[PDB]
Design a protein around this ligand. Structure first.
Ligand SMILES: *CC(=O)NCC1CCN(S(=O)(=O)c2ccc(I)cc2)CC1
Ligand SMILES: *CC(=O)NCC1CCN(S(=O)(=O)c2ccc(I)cc2)CC1
Ligand SMILES: [Cl-]
Ligand SMILES: [Cl-]
Ligand SMILES: [Mg+2]
Ligand SMILES: [Mg+2]
Ligand SMILES: [Mg+2]
Ligand SMILES: [Mg+2]
Ligand SMILES: [Mg+2]
Ligand SMILES: [Mg+2]
Ligand SMILES: [Mg+2]
Lengths: 235, 9, 229, 9
């Protein structure tokens, strides 16, 4: 409810409880409140913020996809009598999804991106901005779609530029960014050539430095496997 | 399949 | 604005929400459909039941996690406060379901199958309230669950065959009530064993459309009996 | 283990 007066440490503790309870909407709200306390986030805290909102929007995206498929199948069949209910319900889910994306983008703009000290956290938040514009782009139509795509591209490119200057090629944040930007190219921007070349370069450059911390090894190698899987799917 | 993006760690 | 949608459109949207795994929406649609004032079909009762059981199921699982953490901690105020918040939301949903059963669904008329189904559901949602209740209110809640289940049992024994899936599901849940809520393991085991045996004795008369469901409930009776003995 | 009640059909 009224989180402005709540102890920041209490909001983080409650976000962790909500995570254990698989209450991701609550978790997200707690982390929004924590962000709004106005301090920078730690690593753990970025992870909580990310997990919470990705679970919420993940659910909405999955539901949207089901409904869109039913809508399209219905319309294609073209029966004089079916279609209005699924359209309206798809629009309801879509509106809710857009609302969550707008919340995340608002927090990034109002609190997180400007206030980040270090390059690593700046890249993480710019990546997140790219991702939530990408989720808006999945459901956008027409001219709004073009603007949204441009916004995603701009955020990702800025992140990429920083990451190449400031972070090693095996850094999990740099890897996750490159993976997601390649997905943007393929799925959103209809640029398969760019997707494939970014994914291949990312994979190869990470492999070349793989011999250098065990603390990041599991995360980095998991992203490299997803790059490989995408490359197999795309070729 | 859809492409895979970065998961939850 | 559920009330501004036609009944057929509310049912259609409940089915869509089911496909999308959006159970809160599904429940809201089914509540609107109930409020149109027509009886529900079997299919439609199943939609209502699935929707609300999924919602409260999530709440119950979350409550159990938080309650466990709370109890381990006791062995700051945050876990109590958050457990209380989840608990209040769970009670809200149970109250919504119980309100609909009372205001619209439970009636003196209609076939025995639907009467027993709704009385069973009343017992279930009082049982979910009992899981979280502490104090004097707990005794009242337990009595309400018992009364609902017993009335359902009495109807089912007079009016329905022993292998009917609604009769079976009711007996299974009433046995769970005895074991987990009412501190009555002897009655739980006796009810489950009698239910199982009487159902198996008449299984050869059960229609094929009920076979899968009835056999699943009989398996759960067997598994509970193994757990309890 | 918790007792099992009737599942969703
Ligand atoms: C130290 C830190 O800043 N926090 C952990 C982050 C959350 C998730 N990101 S990510 O979205 O870039 C990502 C990379 C790799 C994997 I496996 C999952 C997510 C990384 C930093
Ligand atoms: C014809 C009918 O009234 N509808 C289907 C019902 C919904 C669920 N109930 S139940 O809660 O008693 C139940 C029985 C068996 C199983 I497997 C699951 C639930 C049955 C009737
Ligand atoms: Cl709708
Ligand atoms: Cl709380
Ligand atoms: Mg302080
Ligand atoms: Mg037709
Ligand atoms: Mg729209
Ligand atoms: Mg550096
Ligand atoms: Mg009407
Ligand atoms: Mg309470
Ligand atoms: Mg009378």
């Amino acid at each position: 409810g009224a989180m402005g007066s709540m102890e920041r440490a209490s909001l983080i503790q409650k976000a962790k409880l909500a995570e254990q309870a698989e209450r991701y909407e609550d978790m997200a709200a707690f982390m929004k409140g924590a962000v709004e306390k106005g301090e920078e986030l730690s690593c753990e805290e970025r992870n909580l913020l990310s997990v919470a909102y990705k679970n919420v929007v993940g659910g909405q995206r999955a539901a949207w996809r089901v409904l869109s498929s039913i809508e399209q199948k219905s319309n294609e069949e073209g029966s004089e009598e079916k279609g209005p209910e699924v359209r309206e319900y798809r629009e309801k889910v879509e509106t809710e999804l857009q609302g969550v994306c707008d919340t995340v983008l608002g927090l990034l703009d109002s609190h997180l991106i400007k206030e980040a000290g270090d390059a690593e956290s700046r890249v993480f938040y710019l990546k997140m901005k790219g991702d939530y514009y990408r989720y808006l782009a999945e459901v956008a139509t027409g001219d709004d779609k073009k603007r949204i795509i441009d916004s995603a591209r701009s955020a990702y490119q800025e992140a990429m530029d920083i990451s190449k200057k400031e972070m090693p090629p095996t850094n999990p944040i740099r890897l996750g960014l490159a993976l997601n930007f390649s997905v943007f190219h393929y799925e959103i921007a209809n640029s398969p050539e760019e997707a494939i070349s970014l994914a291949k370069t990312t994979f190869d450059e990470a492999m070349a430095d793989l011999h250098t911390s065990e603390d990041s090894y599991k995360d980095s190698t998991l992203i490299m496997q997803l790059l490989r899987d995408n490359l197999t799917l795309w070729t | 399949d859809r492409s895979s993006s970065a998961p939850n760690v």
